[PDB]
Copies of this chain bind each other. A is one copy, B any other.
Amino acid sequence: YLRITNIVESSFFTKFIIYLIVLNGITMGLETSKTFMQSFGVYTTLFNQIVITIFTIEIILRIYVHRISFFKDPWSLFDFFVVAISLVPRVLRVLRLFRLVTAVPQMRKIVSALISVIPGMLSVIALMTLFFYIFAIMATQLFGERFPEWFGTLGESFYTLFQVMTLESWSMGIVRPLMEVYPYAWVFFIPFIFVVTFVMINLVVAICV
């Protein structure tokens, strides 16, 4: 019993996993090259199953070693799903290259120390969706009639507005043609770009605290 617990939390075992991680990453970085998957595709498709096989064992062990304690450690928890994904018979399997974040304790803090920023802002983030929701409704029934590729859908109003938010081709690509049919659209968007922009500065400042 306790004999197994010593194998898991050993430096050897953990270090061994991280080696396979770095390796299986390189394996997926050659599954891209058509030339490679031609000559060595057979070599790889099995080699991957070996890895996800070993990772199945470890995650099973990690469960028996931790029992109910396991499904409260996110990194440990997260690792579980990412293999289940890898189990299901194709692109989302590459998420298992995130365990290199989990398996390395130097990263876990960085992720957490940056997710620690998320809560002090959800009061702001939640506001935006409401702000976006009303506007996406306005546009889709304002400009949605003549510019449907941009505003034909409520959701389509989202993508264009978040783009205009990012300031990519907001003027030449969206606002200028809009102003050829609705010449006052410069009253809709110029403030919206200000309103949304004002948020970002005060956030950055609020976080430097």
B-binding residues in A (CB < 8 A): 25, 28-29, 31-33, 90-91, 94-95, 97-98, 100-101, 106-107, 109-111, 113-114, 117, 123-124, 126-127, 130, 133-134, 136-138, 140-142, 144, 153-155, 157, 159, 162-163, 166-173, 175, 179, 186, 190, 193, 198-199, 201-209
Contacts and interface: CB of A to CB of B under 8 A. Distances in A.
Nearest to A188: B91
A155 B185 CA distance: 13
A110 to B, nearest CB: 5
A137 B32 CA distance: 6
This chain: copies in complex: 4
24 contacts: A25-B134, A28-B134, A28-B137, A29-B137, A31-B141, A32-B157, A33-B154, A91-B142, A94-B138, A97-B130, A97-B133, A97-B134, A100-B130, A101-B127, A107-B127, A110-B127, A111-B127, A155-B186, A159-B175, A163-B172, A167-B167, A168-B172, A205-B207, A208-B209
